[PDB]
Amino acid sequence: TTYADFIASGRTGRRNAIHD
Amino acid sequence: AAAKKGSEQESVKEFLAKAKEDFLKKWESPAQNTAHLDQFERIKTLGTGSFGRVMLVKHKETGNHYAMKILDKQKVVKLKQIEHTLNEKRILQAVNFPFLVKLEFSFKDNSNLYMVMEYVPGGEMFSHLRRIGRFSEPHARFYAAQIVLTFEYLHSLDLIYRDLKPENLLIDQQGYIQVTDFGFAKRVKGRTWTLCGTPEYLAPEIILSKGYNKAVDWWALGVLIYEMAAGYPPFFADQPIQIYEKIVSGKVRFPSHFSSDLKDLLRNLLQVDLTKRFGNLKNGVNDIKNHKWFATTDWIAIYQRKVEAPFIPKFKGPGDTSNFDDYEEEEIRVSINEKCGKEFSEF
Numbered sequence A: 001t002t003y004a005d006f007i008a009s010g011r012t013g014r015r016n017a018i019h020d
Numbered sequence B: 001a002a003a004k005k006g007s008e009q010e011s012v013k014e015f016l017a018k019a020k021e022d023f024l025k026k027w028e029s030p031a032q033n034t035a036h037l038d039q040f041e042r043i044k045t046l047g048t049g050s051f052g053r054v055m056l057v058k059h060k061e062t063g064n065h066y067a068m069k070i071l072d073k074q075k076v077v078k079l080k081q082i083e084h085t086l087n088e089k090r091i092l093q094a095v096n097f098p099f100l101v102k103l104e105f106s107f108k109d110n111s112n113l114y115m116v117m118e119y120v121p122g123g124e125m126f127s128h129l130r131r132i133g134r135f136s137e138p139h140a141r142f143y144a145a146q147i148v149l150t151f152e153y154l155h156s157l158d159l160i161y162r163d164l165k166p167e168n169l170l171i172d173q174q175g176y177i178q179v180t181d182f183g184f185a186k187r188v189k190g191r192t193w194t195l196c197g198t199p200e201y202l203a204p205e206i207i208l209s210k211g212y213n214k215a216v217d218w219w220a221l222g223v224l225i226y227e228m229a230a231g232y233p234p235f236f237a238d239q240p241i242q243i244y245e246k247i248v249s250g251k252v253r254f255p256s257h258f259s260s261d262l263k264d265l266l267r268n269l270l271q272v273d274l275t276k277r278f279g280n281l282k283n284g285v286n287d288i289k290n291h292k293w294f295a296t297t298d299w300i301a302i303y304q305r306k307v308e309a310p311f312i313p314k315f316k317g318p319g320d321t322s323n324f325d326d327y328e329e330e331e332i333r334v335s336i337n338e339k340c341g342k343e344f345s346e347f
């Protein structure tokens, strides 16, 4: 499932801003 | 429906006109040096960033709790965020809206910049969303409505916010949203070019280095509503480059439990074509406010905080931080030498 794929990904924690 | 110009629109116009008057006064003469570090007792870290942290503090003379953001001037300079930090403070001291966290004091010393804001004890939307999985559409609509009104307010002052995400939205004691983190907010007429934001939330024109305006906030609103209602963002991957490839592709897929009204709103917000993106058309924000998905929303009642919230955060007395994660603490050191004085002179 999409949800399972999300949960197993490296981006379910707080996401840092970018700016370069 | 979203084009009509009855009396209701003139009330909004009158409201926004007075708001701009107040804003401009403060914008043109910013408050500066309105407290000192020793007036606050530092208690616990509430969150962190690349060049600073936010701590729970208690104001000694009143016993009020606040959230004090502490930014290391040298680190700001190294990351080339001087002007953005000046933007943040100048804008935040000038604005006033029910869903905007207030800047109560600001000051600086040899080492650091300080922004003392209201403490919002309910924690980040991010924490609650991840834990519960996803919000119901009525729950998401409630929060979404507040962002819509907030962007209407901000955009009328020629401000762009540029970092909408659950990490940047706090829940207050009444269950309403408080927007914080004005680090990328900017006052600009016409167009700007800075590459900034968070990868999941970036509009295609930002990724493609096109030059852009307030329409990127409305795209970000699309991403936010999707993530609230789905439990995951519309474009995710392990690496940012793959996220960007999905974003510019023009393809979005919706969970089967998304209502048809929700999918329709989201297709108009997650619109790669600026000539077609909701919030960016002739009817402005009113294409959004009059969309079918918001039919049940009483915008005035939202503004007045008369609507019943989906949930009220657990509150264990004042100073309780149980709705926030724990972070590693670090002693504040103030150098005996002034750092970066010229760069931050107007702060």
Ligand SMILES: O=C(c1cccc(F)c1)[C@H]1CNC[C@@H]1c1ccc2c(=O)[nH]cnc2c1
Residues within 6 Å of the ligand: B046, B047, B048, B049, B050, B051, B052, B053, B054, B066, B067, B069, B101, B117, B118, B119, B120, B121, B124, B167, B168, B170, B180, B181, B183
């Ligand atoms: O800790 C934070 C932080 C730390 C350093 C830099 C920065 F830009 C932000 C922010 C990031 N998202 C929320 C976090 C936060 C956590 C709590 C409050 C608060 O109680 N009042 C005002 N802003 C707050 C902001």
